[PDB]
Coordinates of C-alpha atoms and ligand atoms in Angstrom, one line a residue:
X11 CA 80.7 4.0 -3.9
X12 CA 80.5 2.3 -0.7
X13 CA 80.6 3.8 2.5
X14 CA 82.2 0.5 4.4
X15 CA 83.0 -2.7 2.9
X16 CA 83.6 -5.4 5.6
X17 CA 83.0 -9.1 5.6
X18 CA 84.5 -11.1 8.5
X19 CA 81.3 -12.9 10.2
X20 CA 79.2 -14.9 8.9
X21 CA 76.5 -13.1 8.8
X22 CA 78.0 -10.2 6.2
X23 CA 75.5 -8.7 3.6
X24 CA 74.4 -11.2 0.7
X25 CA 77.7 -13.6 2.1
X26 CA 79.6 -11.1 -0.1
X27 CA 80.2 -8.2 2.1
X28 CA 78.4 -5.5 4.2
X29 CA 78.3 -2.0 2.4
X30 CA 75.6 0.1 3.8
X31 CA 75.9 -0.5 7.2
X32 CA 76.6 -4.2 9.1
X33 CA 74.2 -6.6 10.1
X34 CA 75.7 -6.8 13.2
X35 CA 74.8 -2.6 13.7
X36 CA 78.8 -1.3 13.0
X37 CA 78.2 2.0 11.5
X38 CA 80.6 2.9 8.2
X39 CA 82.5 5.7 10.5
X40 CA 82.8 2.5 13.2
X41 CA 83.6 -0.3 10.3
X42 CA 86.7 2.7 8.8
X43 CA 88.2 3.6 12.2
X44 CA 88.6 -0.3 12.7
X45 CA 90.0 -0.8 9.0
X46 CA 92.3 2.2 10.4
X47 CA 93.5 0.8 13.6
X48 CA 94.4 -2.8 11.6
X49 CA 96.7 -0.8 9.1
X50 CA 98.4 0.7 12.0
X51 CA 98.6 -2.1 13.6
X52 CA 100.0 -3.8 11.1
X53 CA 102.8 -1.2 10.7
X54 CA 103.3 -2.1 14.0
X55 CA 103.9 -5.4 13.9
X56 CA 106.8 -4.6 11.0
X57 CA 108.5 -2.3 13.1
X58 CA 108.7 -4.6 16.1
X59 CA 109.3 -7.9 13.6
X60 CA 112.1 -5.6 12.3
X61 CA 113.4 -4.6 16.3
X62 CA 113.2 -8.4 17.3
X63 CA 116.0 -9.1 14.0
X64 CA 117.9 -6.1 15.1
X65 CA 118.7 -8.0 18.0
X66 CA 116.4 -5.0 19.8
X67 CA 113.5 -5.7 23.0
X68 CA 110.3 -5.2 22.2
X69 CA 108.2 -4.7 25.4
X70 CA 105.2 -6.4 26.4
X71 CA 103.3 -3.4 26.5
X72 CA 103.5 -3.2 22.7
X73 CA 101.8 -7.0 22.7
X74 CA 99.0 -6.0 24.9
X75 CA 98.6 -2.7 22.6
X76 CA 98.2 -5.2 19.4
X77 CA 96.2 -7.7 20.7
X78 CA 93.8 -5.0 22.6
X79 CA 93.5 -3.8 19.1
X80 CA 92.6 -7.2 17.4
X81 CA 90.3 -8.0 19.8
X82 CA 88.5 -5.0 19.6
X83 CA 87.8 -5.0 16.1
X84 CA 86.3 -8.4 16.4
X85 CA 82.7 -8.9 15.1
X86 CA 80.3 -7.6 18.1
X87 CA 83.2 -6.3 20.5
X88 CA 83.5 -2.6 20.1
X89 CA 81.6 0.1 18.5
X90 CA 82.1 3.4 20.4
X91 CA 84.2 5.7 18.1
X92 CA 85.9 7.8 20.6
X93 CA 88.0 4.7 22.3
X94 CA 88.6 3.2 18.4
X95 CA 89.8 6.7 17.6
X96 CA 92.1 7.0 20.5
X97 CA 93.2 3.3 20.1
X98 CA 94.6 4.6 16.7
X99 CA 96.5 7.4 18.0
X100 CA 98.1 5.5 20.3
X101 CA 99.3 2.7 17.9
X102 CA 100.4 5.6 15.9
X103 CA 102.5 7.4 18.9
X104 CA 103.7 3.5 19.8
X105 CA 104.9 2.3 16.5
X106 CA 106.3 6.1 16.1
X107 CA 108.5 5.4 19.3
X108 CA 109.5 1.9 18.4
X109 CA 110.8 3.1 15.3
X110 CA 112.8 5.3 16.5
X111 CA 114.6 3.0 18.0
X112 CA 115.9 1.3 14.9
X113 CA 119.1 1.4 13.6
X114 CA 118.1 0.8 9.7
X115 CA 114.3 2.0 8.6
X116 CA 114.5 1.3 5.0
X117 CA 111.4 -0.2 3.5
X118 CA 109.4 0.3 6.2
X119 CA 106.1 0.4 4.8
X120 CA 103.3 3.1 4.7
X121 CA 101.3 1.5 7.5
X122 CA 104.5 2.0 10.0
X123 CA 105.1 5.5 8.9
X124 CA 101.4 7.0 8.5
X125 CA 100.0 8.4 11.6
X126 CA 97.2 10.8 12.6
X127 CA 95.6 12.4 15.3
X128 CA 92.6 13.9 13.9
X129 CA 89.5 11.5 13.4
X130 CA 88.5 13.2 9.9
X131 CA 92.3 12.0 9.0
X132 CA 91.7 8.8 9.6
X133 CA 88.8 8.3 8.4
X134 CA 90.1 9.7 4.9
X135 CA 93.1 6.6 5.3
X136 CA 90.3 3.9 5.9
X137 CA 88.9 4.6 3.2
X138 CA 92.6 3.3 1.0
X139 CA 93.2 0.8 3.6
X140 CA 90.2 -1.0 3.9
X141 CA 89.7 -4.9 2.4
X142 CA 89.2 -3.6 -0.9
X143 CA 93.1 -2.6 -1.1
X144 CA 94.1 -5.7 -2.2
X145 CA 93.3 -5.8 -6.2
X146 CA 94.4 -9.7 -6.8
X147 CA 91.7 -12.6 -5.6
X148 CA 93.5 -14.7 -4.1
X149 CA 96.2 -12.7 -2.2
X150 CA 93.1 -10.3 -0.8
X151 CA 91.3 -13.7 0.1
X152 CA 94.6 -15.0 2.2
X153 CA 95.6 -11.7 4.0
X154 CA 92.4 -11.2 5.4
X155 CA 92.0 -15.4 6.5
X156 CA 95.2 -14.6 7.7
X157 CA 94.3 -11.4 9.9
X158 CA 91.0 -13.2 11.2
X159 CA 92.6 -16.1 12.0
X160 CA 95.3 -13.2 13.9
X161 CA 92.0 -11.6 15.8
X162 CA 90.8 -14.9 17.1
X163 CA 94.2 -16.2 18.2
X164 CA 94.8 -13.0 19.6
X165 CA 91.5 -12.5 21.5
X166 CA 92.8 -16.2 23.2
X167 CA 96.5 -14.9 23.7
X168 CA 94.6 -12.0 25.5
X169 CA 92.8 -14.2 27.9
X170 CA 96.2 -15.8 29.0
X171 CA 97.8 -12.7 29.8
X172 CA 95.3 -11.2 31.8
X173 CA 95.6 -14.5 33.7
X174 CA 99.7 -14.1 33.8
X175 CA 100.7 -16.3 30.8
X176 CA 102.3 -15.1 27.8
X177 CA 104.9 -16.3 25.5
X178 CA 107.3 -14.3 23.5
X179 CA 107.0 -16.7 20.3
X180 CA 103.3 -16.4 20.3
X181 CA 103.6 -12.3 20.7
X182 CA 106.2 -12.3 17.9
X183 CA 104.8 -14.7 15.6
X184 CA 101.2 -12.4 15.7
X185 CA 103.1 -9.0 15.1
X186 CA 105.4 -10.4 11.9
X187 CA 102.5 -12.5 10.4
X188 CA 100.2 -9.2 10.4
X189 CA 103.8 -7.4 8.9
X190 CA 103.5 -10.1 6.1
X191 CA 99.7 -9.5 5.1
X192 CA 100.9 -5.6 3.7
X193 CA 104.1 -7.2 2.1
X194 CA 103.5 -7.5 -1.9
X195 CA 106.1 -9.8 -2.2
X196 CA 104.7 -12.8 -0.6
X197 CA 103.6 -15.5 -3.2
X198 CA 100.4 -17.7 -3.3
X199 CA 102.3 -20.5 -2.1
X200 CA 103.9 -18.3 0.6
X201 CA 100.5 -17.1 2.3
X202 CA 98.7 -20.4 2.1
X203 CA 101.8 -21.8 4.1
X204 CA 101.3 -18.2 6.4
X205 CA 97.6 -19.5 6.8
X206 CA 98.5 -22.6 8.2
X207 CA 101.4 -21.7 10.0
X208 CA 98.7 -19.2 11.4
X209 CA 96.8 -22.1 12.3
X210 CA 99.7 -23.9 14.2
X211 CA 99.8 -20.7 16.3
X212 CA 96.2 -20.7 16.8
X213 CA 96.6 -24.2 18.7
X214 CA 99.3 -22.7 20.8
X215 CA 97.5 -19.9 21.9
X216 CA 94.5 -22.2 22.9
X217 CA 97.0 -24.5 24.6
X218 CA 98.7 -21.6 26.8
X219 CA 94.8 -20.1 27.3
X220 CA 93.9 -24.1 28.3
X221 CA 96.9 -23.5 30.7
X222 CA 96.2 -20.5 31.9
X223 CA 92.7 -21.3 32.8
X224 CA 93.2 -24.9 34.2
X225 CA 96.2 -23.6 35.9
X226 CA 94.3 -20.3 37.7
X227 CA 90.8 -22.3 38.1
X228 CA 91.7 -26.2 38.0
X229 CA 90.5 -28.9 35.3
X230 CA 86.9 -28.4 34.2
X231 CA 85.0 -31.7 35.8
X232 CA 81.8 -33.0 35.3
X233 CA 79.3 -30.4 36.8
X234 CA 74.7 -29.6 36.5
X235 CA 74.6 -26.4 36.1
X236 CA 70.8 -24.5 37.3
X237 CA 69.5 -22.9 34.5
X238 CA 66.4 -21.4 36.8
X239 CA 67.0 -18.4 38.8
X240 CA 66.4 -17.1 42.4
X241 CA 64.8 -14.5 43.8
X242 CA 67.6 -12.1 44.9
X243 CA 68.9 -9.2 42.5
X244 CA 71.6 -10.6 40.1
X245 CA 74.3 -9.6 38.4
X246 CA 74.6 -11.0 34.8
X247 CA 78.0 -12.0 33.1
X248 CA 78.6 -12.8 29.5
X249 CA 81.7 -13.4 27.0
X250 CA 84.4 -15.4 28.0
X251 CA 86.9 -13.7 31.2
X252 CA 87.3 -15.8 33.5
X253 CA 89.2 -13.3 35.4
X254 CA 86.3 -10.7 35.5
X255 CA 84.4 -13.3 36.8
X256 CA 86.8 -14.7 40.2
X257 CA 86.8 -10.3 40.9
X258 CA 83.4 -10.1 40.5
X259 CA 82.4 -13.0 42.7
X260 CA 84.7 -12.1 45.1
X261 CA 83.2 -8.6 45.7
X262 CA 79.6 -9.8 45.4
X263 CA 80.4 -12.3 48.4
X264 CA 78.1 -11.0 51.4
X265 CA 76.5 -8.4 49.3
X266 CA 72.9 -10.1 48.6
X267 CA 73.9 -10.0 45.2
X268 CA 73.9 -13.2 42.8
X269 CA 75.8 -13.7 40.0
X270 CA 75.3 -15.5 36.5
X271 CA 76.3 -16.5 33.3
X272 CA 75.4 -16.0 30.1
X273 CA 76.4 -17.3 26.5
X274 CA 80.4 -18.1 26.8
X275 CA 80.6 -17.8 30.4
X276 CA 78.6 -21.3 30.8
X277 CA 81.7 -22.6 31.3
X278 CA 83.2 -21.2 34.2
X279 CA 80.5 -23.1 36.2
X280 CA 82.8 -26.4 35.1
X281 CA 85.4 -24.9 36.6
X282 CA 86.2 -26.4 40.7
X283 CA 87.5 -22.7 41.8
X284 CA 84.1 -21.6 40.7
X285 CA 82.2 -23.5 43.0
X286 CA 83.2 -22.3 46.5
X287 CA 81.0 -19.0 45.7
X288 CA 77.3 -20.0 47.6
X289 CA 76.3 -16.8 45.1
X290 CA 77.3 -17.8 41.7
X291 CA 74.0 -19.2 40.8
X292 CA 73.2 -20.4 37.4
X293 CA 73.5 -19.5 33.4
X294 CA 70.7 -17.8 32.3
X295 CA 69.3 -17.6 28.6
X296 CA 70.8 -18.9 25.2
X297 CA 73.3 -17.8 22.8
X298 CA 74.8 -14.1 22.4
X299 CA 71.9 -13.3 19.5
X300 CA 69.3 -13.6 21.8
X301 CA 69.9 -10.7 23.7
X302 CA 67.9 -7.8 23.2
X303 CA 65.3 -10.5 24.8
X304 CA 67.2 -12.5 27.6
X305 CA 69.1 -9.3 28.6
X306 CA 65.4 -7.3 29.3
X307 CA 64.0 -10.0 31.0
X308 CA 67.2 -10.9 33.5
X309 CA 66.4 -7.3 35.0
X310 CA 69.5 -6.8 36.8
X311 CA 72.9 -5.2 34.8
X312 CA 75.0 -7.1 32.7
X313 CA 79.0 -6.9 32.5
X314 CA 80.1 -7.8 29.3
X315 CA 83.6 -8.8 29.4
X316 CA 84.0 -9.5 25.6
X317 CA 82.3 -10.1 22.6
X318 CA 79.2 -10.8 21.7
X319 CA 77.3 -7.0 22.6
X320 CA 74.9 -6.1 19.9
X321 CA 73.4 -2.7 20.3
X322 CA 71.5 -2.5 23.1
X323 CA 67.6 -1.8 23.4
X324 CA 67.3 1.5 25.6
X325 CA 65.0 -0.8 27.4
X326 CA 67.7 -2.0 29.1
X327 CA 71.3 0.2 28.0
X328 CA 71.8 1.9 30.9
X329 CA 72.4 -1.1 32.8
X330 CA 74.7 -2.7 30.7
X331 CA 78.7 -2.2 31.4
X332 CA 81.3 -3.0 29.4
X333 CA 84.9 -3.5 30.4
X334 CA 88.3 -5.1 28.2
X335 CA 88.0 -3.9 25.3
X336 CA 84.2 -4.2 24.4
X337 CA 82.3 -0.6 24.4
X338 CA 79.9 1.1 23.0
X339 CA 79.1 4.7 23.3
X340 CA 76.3 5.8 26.1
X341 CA 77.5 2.1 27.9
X342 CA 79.2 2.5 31.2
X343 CA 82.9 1.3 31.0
X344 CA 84.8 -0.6 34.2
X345 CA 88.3 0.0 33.1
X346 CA 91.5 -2.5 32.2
X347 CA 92.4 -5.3 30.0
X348 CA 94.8 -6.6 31.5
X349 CA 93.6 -8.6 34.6
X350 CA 94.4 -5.8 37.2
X351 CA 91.6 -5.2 39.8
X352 CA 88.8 -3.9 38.6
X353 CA 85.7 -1.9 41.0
X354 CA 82.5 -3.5 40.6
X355 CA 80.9 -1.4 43.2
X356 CA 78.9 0.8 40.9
X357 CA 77.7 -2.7 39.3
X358 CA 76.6 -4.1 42.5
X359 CA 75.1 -0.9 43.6
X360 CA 72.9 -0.6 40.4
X361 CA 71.5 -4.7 40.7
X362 CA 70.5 -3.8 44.4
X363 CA 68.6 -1.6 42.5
X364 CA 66.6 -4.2 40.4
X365 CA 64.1 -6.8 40.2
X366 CA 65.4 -10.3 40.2
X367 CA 65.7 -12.5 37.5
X368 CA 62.3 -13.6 35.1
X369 CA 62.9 -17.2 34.6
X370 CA 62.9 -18.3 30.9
X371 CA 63.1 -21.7 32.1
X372 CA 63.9 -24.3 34.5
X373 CA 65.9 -27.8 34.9
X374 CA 69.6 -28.0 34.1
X375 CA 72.4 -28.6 32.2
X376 CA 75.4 -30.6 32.4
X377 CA 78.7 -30.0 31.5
X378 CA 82.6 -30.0 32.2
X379 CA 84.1 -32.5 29.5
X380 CA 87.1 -30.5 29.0
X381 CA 90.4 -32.7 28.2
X382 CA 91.6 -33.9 31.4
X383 CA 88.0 -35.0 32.7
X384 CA 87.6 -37.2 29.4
X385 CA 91.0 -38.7 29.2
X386 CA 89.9 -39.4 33.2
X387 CA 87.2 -41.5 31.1
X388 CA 89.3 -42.4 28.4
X389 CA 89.2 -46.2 29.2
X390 CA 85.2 -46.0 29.1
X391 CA 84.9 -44.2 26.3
X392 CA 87.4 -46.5 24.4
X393 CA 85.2 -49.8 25.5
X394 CA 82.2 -47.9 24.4
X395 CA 83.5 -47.9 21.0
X396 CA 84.9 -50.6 21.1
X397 CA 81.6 -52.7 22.1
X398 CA 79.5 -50.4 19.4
X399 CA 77.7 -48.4 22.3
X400 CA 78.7 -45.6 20.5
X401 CA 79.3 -45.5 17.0
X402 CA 80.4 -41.9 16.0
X403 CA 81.2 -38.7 17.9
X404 CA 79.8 -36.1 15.9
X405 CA 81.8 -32.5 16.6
X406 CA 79.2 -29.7 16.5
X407 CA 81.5 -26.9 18.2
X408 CA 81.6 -23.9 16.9
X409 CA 79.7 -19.9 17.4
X410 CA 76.3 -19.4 17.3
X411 CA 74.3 -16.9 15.5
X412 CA 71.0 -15.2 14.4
X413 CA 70.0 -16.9 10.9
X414 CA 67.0 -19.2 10.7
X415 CA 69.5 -21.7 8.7
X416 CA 71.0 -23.0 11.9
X417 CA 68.0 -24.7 12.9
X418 CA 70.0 -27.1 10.8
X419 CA 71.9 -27.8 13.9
X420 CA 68.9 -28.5 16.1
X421 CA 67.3 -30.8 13.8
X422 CA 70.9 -32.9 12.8
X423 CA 71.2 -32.8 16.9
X424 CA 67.5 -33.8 17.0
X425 CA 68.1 -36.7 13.9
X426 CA 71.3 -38.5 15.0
X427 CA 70.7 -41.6 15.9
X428 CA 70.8 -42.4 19.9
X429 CA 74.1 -44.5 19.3
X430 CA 76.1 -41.2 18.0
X431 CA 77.8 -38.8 20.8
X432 CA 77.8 -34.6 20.4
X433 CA 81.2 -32.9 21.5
X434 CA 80.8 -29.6 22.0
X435 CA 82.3 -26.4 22.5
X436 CA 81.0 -22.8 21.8
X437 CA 78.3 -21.1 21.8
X438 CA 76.9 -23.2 19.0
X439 CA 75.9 -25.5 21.8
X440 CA 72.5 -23.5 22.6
X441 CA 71.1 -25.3 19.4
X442 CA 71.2 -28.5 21.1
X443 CA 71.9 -28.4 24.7
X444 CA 68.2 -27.7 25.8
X445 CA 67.0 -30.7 24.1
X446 CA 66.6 -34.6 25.9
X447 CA 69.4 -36.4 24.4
X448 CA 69.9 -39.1 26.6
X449 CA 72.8 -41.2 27.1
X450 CA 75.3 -44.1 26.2
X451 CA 76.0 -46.3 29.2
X452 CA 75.9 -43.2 31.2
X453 CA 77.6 -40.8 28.8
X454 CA 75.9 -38.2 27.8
X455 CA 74.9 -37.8 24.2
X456 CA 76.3 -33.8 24.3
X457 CA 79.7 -33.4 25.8
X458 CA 80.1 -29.5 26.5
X459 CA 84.1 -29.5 26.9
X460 CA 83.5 -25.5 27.8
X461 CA 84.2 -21.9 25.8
X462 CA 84.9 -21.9 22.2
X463 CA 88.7 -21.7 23.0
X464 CA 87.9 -25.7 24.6
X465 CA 87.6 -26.7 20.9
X466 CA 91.1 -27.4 21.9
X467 CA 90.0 -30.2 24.3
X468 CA 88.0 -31.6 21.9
X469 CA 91.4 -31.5 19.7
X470 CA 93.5 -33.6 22.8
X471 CA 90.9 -35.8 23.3
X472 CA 90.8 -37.0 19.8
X473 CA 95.0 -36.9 19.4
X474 CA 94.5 -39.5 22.8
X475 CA 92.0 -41.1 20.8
X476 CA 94.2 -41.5 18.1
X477 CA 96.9 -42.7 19.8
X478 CA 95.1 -45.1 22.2
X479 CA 93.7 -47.2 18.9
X480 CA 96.9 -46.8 17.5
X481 CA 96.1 -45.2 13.7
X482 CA 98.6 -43.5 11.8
X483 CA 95.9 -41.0 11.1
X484 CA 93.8 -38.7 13.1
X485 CA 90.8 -39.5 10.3
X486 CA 90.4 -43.0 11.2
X487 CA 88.6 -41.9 13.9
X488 CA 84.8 -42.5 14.0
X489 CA 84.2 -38.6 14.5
X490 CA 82.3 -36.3 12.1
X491 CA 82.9 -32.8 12.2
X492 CA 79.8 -30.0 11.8
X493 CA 81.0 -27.3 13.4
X494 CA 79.6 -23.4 13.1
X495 CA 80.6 -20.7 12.7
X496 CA 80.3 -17.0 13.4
X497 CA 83.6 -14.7 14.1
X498 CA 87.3 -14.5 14.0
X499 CA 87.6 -16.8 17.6
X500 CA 85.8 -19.4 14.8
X501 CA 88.3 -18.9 12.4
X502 CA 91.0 -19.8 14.1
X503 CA 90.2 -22.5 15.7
X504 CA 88.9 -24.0 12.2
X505 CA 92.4 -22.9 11.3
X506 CA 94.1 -24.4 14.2
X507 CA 92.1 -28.3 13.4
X508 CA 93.3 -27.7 9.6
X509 CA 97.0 -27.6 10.8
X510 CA 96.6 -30.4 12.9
X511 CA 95.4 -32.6 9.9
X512 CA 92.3 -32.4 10.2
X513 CA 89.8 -33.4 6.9
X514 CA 86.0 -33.6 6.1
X515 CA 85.2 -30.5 8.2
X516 CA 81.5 -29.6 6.9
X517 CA 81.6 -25.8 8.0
X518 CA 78.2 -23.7 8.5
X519 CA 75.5 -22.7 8.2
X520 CA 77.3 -21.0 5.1
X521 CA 81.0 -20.8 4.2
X522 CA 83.0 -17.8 4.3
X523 CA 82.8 -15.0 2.3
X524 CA 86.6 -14.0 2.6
X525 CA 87.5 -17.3 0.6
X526 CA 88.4 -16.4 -2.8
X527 CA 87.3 -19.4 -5.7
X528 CA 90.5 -20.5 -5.8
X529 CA 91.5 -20.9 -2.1
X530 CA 88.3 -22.4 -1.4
X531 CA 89.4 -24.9 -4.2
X532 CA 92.5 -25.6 -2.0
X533 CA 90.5 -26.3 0.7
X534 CA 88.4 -29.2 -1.1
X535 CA 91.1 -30.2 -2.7
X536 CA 93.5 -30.8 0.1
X537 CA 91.2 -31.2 3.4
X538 CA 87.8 -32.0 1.6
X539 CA 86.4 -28.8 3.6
X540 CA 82.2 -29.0 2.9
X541 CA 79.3 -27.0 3.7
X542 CA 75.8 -28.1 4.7
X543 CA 71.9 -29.0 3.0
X544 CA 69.3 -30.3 5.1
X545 CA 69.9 -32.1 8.2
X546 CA 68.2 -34.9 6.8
X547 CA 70.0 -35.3 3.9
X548 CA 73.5 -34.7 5.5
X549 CA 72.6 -37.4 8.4
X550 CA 72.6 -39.8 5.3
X551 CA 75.5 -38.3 3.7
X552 CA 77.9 -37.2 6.5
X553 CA 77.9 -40.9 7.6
Ligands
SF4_612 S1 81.4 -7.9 11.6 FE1 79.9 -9.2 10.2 S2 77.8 -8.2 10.2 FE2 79.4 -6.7 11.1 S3 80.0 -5.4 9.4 FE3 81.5 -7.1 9.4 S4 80.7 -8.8 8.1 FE4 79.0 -7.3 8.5

């Protein structure tokens, strides 16, 4: 018998499922409290799905409750017990309340009636609740694409709000599609149309993130960003809030205290708001997976404001701080998730404290080629092609991670021919955004449109694309898409491209182990979804 049985990243046990313990370092107690915490959640989202068609309000504060609790089962976000324990009982004293409030209750399903308060109870529920519940292939292999593609649309839907922007259909649509994954009912045909229906919402939530970022910190715009270090003590900032980020720099202003990015918070240098702060110095280090290594040698804390936190190295634990909904136990927490001031005193305390950065390198990057700085270049892009400057974009966005596979991705970066563009997005751009690429009449050959959330750019720019040479299909387009994956944020946005037509997608460095034989044989069949061999062998073939 197995004491967990999870198998949403790509890096799961075998590409069949983790067992023992994860790879990532969730602990079976860890892995059941989250399989807990999405049962209840799911209950949730029936109740309120069954309010909303009573004619009944639902408050906001449920929305934040279910999308704090997506996002914090997502791979690498949260592994501290006690706050996964007290997430459950208060789902379970929420959807209790909620209920109440209904006039008719009938079939209401176990997962909105069965609460606990006791971790040993819960624990006994994950253990009937987990993935494995499902007996049938291909509705098991639907619910849970489904609920990923629900974490990675909420953990965008999350961002918005804590920037001010949420909409009720996006809020609703989450809580009844996680209502529909428990409901026995639903056909084959039923959940493959949930998945993309999923993946329609997945584009909305990036749009109203794209919105709410844009809006709060204007257009990304073409932008070198150091990616050497100074000599004062630093603060270093990784995962994707942009809002930690304007409180952090905004109390670090006079302090002698730097601040920089890491991994998914590259962006924010793009960003114009960004730049009036003399003390928001550069990005420092590589993807997320390379932490236990950049993390030591930055020296001063780190703030993690979402995913990706591996366990840390007590080298360097006590000065790391979570906040949102990332923890892990013995890490110092800054409270809220919600964008509401946070106190980074403590934080800026501790880096006074430290020695400054070790540089890992020097030089820079360049970036900022989110949607409205490349439709600005829309007319030169379009002559470029047009003239045979550039022959194919080649769409390598996509999440990062640890296996040696994905040097795949450095040496198909490394192997495209110089007439052949990189749009990027994701962490997956540390396999090829330290290499000399060069450019196309001035464009550079890798386009970082920003977080992995920006995929959505790289989705506008090729709808303006399409539309510019006027082709009744988004395929005609000289683009080839080898994108990565790692997590649920991944998911959906692979999700998202499927319901916007999109074919051909080679996915990798291996393809998920949640896709049942005859799913996956949908997703041949009707959007010609590949995987990868050698980079040298797929720069012939892709082509
Ligand atoms: S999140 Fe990934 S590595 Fe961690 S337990 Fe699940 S499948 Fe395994």
């Amino acid at each position: 018998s197995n004491a967990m049985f999870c198998y949403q990243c790509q890096e799961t046990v075998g590409n069949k499922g983790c067992t023992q313990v994860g790879v990532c370092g969730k602990k079976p107690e860890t892995a059941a409290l989250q399989d807990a915490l999405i049962y209840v959640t799911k209950g949730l989202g029936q109740i309120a799905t069954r309010l909303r068609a009573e004619g009944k309000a639902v408050d906001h504060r449920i929305d934040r409750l279910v999308t704090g609790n997506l996002f914090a089962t997502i791979t690498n976000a949260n592994f501290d017990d006690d706050i996964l324990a007290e997430r459950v009982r208060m789902t379970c004293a929420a959807k209790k309340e909620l209920a109440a409030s209904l006039t008719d209750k009938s079939g209401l399903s176990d997962a909105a009636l069965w609460e606990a308060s006791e971790k040993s109870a819960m624990l006994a529920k994950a253990g009937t609740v987990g993935v494995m519940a499902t007996t049938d292939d291909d509705v098991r292999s639907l619910r849970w694409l489904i609920t990923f593609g629900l974490k990675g649309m909420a953990a965008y839907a999350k961002h918005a709000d804590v920037l001010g922007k949420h909409e009720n259909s996006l809020d609703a649509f989450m809580q009844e599609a996680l209502a529909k994954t428990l409901d026995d009912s639903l056909s084959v045909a039923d959940l493959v149309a949930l998945t993309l229906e999923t993946g329609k919402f997945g584009v909305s939530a990036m749009a109203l993130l794209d919105a709410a970022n844009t809006g709060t910190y204007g257009h990304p715009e073409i932008t070198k960003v150091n990616i050497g270090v100074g000599s004062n003590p630093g603060i270093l900032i990784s995962g994707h809030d942009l809002r930690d980020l304007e409180m952090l720099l905004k109390q670090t202003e006079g302090t002698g205290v730097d601040v920089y990015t890491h991994s998914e918070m590259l962006p924010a240098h793009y960003y114009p708001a960004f730049k009036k702060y003399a003390h928001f110095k550069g990005n420092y280090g590589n993807a997320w997976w390379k932490q236990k290594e950049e993390f030591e040698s930055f020296n001063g804390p780190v703030l993690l404001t979402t995913n990706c936190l591996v366990p840390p190295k007590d080298s360097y634990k006590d000065r790391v701080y979570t906040t949102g909904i990332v923890g892990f136990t013995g890490c110092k927490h800054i409270p809220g998730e919600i964008g509401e001031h946070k106190d980074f005193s403590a934080i800026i305390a501790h880096a006074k404290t430290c020695p400054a950065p070790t540089e890992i390198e020097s030089g820079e990057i360049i970036g900022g080629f989110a949607h409205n700085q490349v439709l600005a270049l829309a007319d030169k892009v379009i002559d470029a092609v047009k003239s045979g400057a550039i022959k194919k974009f080649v769409v390598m966005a996509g999440c990062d991670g640890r296996a040696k596979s994905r040097s795949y991705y450095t040496d198909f970066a490394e192997g495209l021919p110089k007439d052949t563009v990189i749009l990027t997005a994701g962490c997956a751009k540390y396999r090829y955004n330290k290499l000399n690429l060069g450019d196309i009449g001035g464009i550079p050959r890798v386009l970082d449109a920003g977080q992995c959330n920006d995929s959505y750019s790289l989705a506008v720019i090729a709808l303006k694309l399409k539309e510019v040479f006027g082709l009744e299909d988004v395929n005609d387009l000289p683009i080839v898409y080898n994108i990565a994956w790692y997590e649920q944020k991944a998911v959906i946005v692979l999700l998202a491209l499927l319901s916007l037509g999109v074919k051909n997608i080679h996915l990798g460095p291996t393809l998920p182990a949640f896709l049942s034989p005859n799913v996956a044989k949908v997703l041949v069949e009707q959007f010609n979804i590949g995987g990868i061999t050698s980079p040298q062998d797929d720069l012939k073939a892709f082509f």
